[PDB]
């Protein structure tokens, strides 16, 4: 792959992380040495068992490593390791939606089923996913019962709790974390690092805005809109 294979060369990476997405929408990864990865591999692919989407079939589907883009040096891990978030899942014959259905291929299908309809050449999606960051989170479910607890310094209810560094008293009140200044915000540098990592991954620009969402411990980072099968990967 012009992108991937060249990136491998430039990075001097020894490891290539094939990443795909399960039906439930959870990214999965398997790691190969660079030696096995050739241009032909993008065509031929690397084969593997099916244990999430499928079963009983004893399915030996192939991970057709997709090539353009999603060729990102693994920002977090130690050894130089690019990722190929682009790994469409293909059946052995009928190069198609593997297992029950590979989401990425379903999306590729829809990509075609827009030009084919002659309605449009491309479709653009710009998601605004919100997340919470906690210090720590605990839960268990037994016959004894079901229990779950949220733990965070920034949590609205953490006033009155004891801390090592002491309690600042500067924390968002309930619903009232809409953009107050850093004493209480207690994120910022973290969001910044998140943004920096994003740029490492997808590319320069791409990151629009970072702010604190309303709920205590709730943060939003904005990423640029893109086409499907691109934005989806992003």
């Amino acid at each position: 792959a012009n992108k991937v294979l060249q990136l491998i060369q430039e990075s001097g990476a020894k490891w290539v992380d094939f990443r795909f997405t399960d039906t439930k929408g959870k990214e999965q990864h398997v790691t190969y040495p660079a030696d096995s990865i050739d241009e032909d591999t993008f065509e031929d692919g690397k084969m593997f068992d099916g244990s999430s989407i499928a079963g009983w079939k004893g399915i030996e589907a192939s991970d057709m490593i997709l090539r353009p883009d999603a060729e990102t040096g693994f920002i977090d891990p130690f050894f130089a390791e690019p990722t190929v978030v682009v790994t469409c899942d293909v059946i052995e014959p009928s190069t198609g939606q593997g297992y029950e259905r590979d989401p990425r291929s379903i999306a590729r299908r829809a990509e075609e089923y827009l030009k084919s309809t002659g309605i449009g050449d491309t479709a653009f999606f710009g998601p605004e996913p919100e997340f919470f960051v906690f210090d720590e989170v605990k839960w268990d479910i037994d016959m004894s019962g079901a229990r779950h607890t949220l733990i965070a310094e920034e949590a609205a209810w953490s006033t009155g709790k004891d801390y090592e560094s002491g309690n600042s008293g500067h924390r968002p009140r309930v619903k009232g974390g809409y953009f107050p200044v850093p004493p209480v915000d207690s994120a910022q540098d973290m969001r910044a690092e998140m943004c920096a990592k994003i740029e490492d991954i997808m590319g320069p620009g791409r990151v629009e805005v970072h702010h604190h969402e309303v709920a205590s411990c709730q943060l939003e980072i904005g990423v640029s809109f893109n086409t499907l099968v691109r934005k989806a990967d992003e």
Binding site: T159, G169, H170, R171, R173, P180, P183, V184
Partner: protein
Amino acid sequence: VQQFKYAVWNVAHQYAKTATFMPKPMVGDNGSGMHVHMSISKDGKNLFAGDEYAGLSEMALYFIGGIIKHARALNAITNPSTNSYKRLVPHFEAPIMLAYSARNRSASIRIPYVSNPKGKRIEARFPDPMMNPYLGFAALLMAGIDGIQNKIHPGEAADKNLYDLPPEEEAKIPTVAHSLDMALEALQADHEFLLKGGVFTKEMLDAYIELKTEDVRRLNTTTHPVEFDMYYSL
């Protein structure tokens, strides 16, 4: 009253527990209130019995009027605690509106279902147990008879609805005192009915007011935890 309080205090104490006749000790749950039932008899005949309104004599209508007129002042002596105004809050189970009905809540004055007109009485729901029985009962009578003497009309009875939309009304509906502060200011202005009969000397009333003001001082001087919540990080 005093004997009742004593009993409950001590019985509880014997059960290793503690009793309090405070209003609103717990926020977010019901306050403790002292509804006061009142009747007048003359040569052993209930003067409150009649056929004016829901079995009420004109006498009793005037009793009502006087109390409604002098209510804000009456809020000291009855509701004589800063805590009292935690109870007297725009919500449900709240005798905050200065009105009368037999079948309406949010009526500060209510006419009990008495069956036999022999025991016909009137109930004032705004007082809390903090009221001095002696001083409190007395003040209610004095205000009541001011009504009678001046033939004070209690106005129309609102039986319809507690608190609804403002047709420039309901907003206009009179409310009891918001603070001991206000109640004491009210009693400064309107103490005349008490002084009649020389029942209440001006020595004691002006004393009482000052002594109660120390309670107000305490509250107003002492920062409340809640202020931390709102103001600490501004």
